[PDB]
Amino acid sequence: PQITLWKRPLVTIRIGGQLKEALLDTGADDTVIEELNLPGCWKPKLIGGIXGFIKVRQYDQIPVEIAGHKAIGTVLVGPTPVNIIGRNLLTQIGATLNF
Amino acid sequence: PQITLWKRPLVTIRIGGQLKEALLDTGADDTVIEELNLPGCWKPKLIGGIXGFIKVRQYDQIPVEIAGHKAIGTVLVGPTPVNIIGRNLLTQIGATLNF
Ligand SMILES: CCCC[C@@H](CN[C@@H](CCCC)C(=O)N[C@@H](CCC(N)=O)C(=O)N[C@@H](CCCNC(N)=[NH2+])C(N)=O)NC(=O)[C@@H](NC(=O)[C@@H](NC(C)=O)[C@@H](C)O)[C@@H](C)CC
């Protein structure tokens, strides 16, 4: 599909069996998901943006379906105000910017 | 252009007569640029990101050329980690996400 930018580009994702809403963020290197009990092993990480840094848990090789398109990669879990799909997964679904 | 996301979507912009580099950011409502002088007078605002909140100066009706495409709109100036072009100006240049 084509997604315009008049409103926030929020889409449905499927991760760890759950459906959630997430923002497609070309300005995010990584994918950051709100809380979420999730699997069994992780590494600590800190990530920053406007503001400052938050602490997150890095999980690897997590399947994430984005608007029906399958992806699999690293997901960071922590107290983000909005679920964010970043470039690591946008590239896997063939997402481009066009103007 | 069509821009893929294997690298950060950094482009050159012209603002106030000056060249800068900025990130095309579908996850940003607003356009936020590092501390600089802009003609005109400004109002204080606060904006948020992953993380927390920062204080910025809001300038309205600022011409900005983004990879050669013209926009005229709001520019927030302050201590952002990265210059970002947000949806307020991305919509003006007709930028969409596609996959
Ligand atoms: C400044 C750093 C680069 C741009 C920024 C854009 N992220 C969005 C995320 C959405 C909120 C969590 C953002 O900050 N958006 C702000 C930008 C400011 C603005 N005024 O537009 C925004 O829209 N803020 C709205 C509110 C958010 C609404 N979003 C939503 N409902 N989904 C506002 N008016 O305050 N990217 C990031 O924050 C990511 N940072 C990065 O990718 C890199 N970090 C740095 C410091 O460059 C990397 C080295 O880690 C985070 C997610 C880690 C992967």
Instruction: Show the domains of chain A with their CATH numbers.
Output: 1-99 (2.40.70.10)
* Structure token pair of residue A18: 């759950």
Question: DSSP letter at B99?
Answer: -
Q: Which two tokens stand for residue B10?
A: 């950094």
The residue to mutate among A46, A56, A84, having the most atoms of ligand 1 within 8 angstroms of its beta carbon, is A84
Q: What is the DSSP letter of A80?
A: -
Method by which the coordinates were obtained: X-ray
Q: Which residues pair with B44 in a beta bridge?
A: B57
- Please say whether the beta carbons of A19 and A30 come within 8 A: no
CA-angle at B5, arms to A96 and B31, nearest 5°: 85
Question: Chain A partners of B1 at a C-beta cutoff of 8 Å?
Answer: 98-99
B60 is catalytic: no
**Nearest CA to B88 among B4, B30, B33?**
B30
Residues A8, A13, A19, A20, CA torsion sign: negative
Cα-to-chain-centroid distance, residue B94? 15
Sign of CA dihedral B70, B74, B79, B85: negative
A26 token code pair: 């070309």
- Residue where the block lists tokens 């980690």: B81
Give the burial class of A58: count Cβ atoms within 10 A of its Cβ; 0-12 exposed, 13-18 middle, 19 or more buried. Answer: middle
Q: Which two tokens stand for residue B43?
A: 């109002």
Cα–Cα dist A71/B45, whole Å = 38
Are A33 and A41 a contacting pair, CB within 8 Å? no
Q: Do B48 and A2 touch (CB under 8 A)?
A: no
Q: Which residues lie closer than 8 Å to B75 by C-beta, 6 or more apart? A: B15, B31, B32, B33, B38, B58, B59, B62, B64
Instruction: In whole angstroms, give the CA distance from residue A73 to residue A66.
Output: 12
